Design a protein around this ligand. Structure first.
Ligand code: MN
Ligand code: NA
Ligand code: NA
Length: 327
DNA sequence: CATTAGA
DNA sequence: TCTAATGA
């Protein structure tokens, strides 16, 4: 956690570089198990050899360890940090919708900067076109102060359409958080469950509404159960318009809300833990359900959940407010 | 790990 | 169809 720091640190640095710049998934994959391990290691690593004893730690890596232990640096790390091409891929990749593959291809053609990207909006597809467009607005955090106004509106419309609609805004905001990256609305409805073969309108109606009133300004991807877009709060009485925000909305088979909800509410850790706990408690929890466990190694049979609690009760735990779903 | 765009 | 990119 701190003793292993630089190590894992230079390690993750390294991996990442293989994967993105190079298309070396293996090496990339190597940097990771190793990084993953030295990570767990309970003592201050003193040299290659020592580390070398570890599984995943080969000679290639060990070797880097020493150089790094000797000089608080690495050549390759230094060379790459310098590396144009590579610096370029690291950067492009930030555009929403630009992943490595594209970032390399772009670069190959010679698009290194944001401006290059502009002069070549044509080579860019819709997603990236928007990503390029709200580049600044996307990189910025969402003040809760705004999250509340966002949530406000969303709830109102949803209800306005059909009153049956149930809608919870998840993530860190749900967990008290000061700011958030994008907004995640879970959604469901009574007429939509596990069996009852969809009703795509279910999603559509809503997006229609939000778009109607000018909340959703664009669409990244709208499909039958997952819509990814961009919203923005009505820019009041001039002088101050609001930044373009990422919003995501997902349809849920009503018979799987709470799990789904319990889940997305996190946190990444409180989840694992809870998960790690339901296990002993003879269960199974996944993004959408909770099934009692059985001794032949495994078992199924999805228990019925009516709220966040049921799941608790089941694994018999303390209902813990979202506020405290920290870990 | 599953959902969407695209070519 | 596969292959990418987001998210989780
Ligand atoms: Mn999120
Ligand atoms: Na070894
Ligand atoms: Na990106």
């Amino acid at each position: 956690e701190t003793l292993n720091g630089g190590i894992t640190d230079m390690l993750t640095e390294l991996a990442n570089f293989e994967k993105n710049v190079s298309q070396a998934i293996h090496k990339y994959n190597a940097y990771r198990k190793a990084a993953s391990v030295i990570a767990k290691y309970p003592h201050k690593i003193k040299s290659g050899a020592e580390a070398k004893k570890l599984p995943g730690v080969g000679t290639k890596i060990a070797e880097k360890i020493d150089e790094f232990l000797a000089t608080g640096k690495l050549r390759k790390l230094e060379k790459i940090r310098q590396d144009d091409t590579s610096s370029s891929i690291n950067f492009l990749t930030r555009v929403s919708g630009i992943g490595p593959s594209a970032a390399r291809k772009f670069v190959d053609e010679g698009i290194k900067t944001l401006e290059d990207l502009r002069k070549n909006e044509d080579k860019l597809n819709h997603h990236q076109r928007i990503g390029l467009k709200y580049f600044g607005d996307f990189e910025k955090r969402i003040p809760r102060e705004e999250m509340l106004q966002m949530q406000d509106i969303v709830l109102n419309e949803v209800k306005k359409v059909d009153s049956e609609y149930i809608a919870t805004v998840c993530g860190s905001f749900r967990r008290g958080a000061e700011s958030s990256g994008d907004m995640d609305v879970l959604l469901t409805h009574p007429s939509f469950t596990s069996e009852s073969t969809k009703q795509p309108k279910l999603l559509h109606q809503v997006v229609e509404q939000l778009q109607k009133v000018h909340f959703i300004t664009d669409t990244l991807s709208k499909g039958e159960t997952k819509f990814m877009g961009v919203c923005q709060l009505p820019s009041k009485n001039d002088e101050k318009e609001y930044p373009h925000r990422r919003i995501d909305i997902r349809l849920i088979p009503k018979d799987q809300y709470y799990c789904g909800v319990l889940y997305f509410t996190g946190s990444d850790i409180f989840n694992k833990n809870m998960r790690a706990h339901a296990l002993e408690k003879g269960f199974t929890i996944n993004e959408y359900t909770i099934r009692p466990l059985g001794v032949t190694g495994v078992a199924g049979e999805p228990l019925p959940v009516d709220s966040e609690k049921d799941i608790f009760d089941y694994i018999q735990w303390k209902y813990r407010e979202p506020k405290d779903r920290s870990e």
